[PDB]
Amino acid sequence: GLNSKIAQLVSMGFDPLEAAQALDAANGDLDVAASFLL
């Protein structure tokens, strides 16, 4: 599940590590992690 979410964030133009770190903080909640990165 997590890798697919990282990939979603990378598809938005974010970098893999910043994406992973946002998802970690967000406990896997992609919508929250995206909001962080915007």
- Single-letter amino acid code for the residue at 14: F
The domain locations on the chain are 2-37
DSSP 6-24: HHHHHHTT--HHHHHHHHH
Contacts of 22 (CB under 8 A, 6+ apart): 9, 14, 33, 34, 36, 37
b/e map 2-37, b = 16+ CB within 10 Å: eeebbeebeeeebeeeebbebbeebeeebeebbebb
Q: Look up residue 28 and give its two tokens.
A: 């896997």
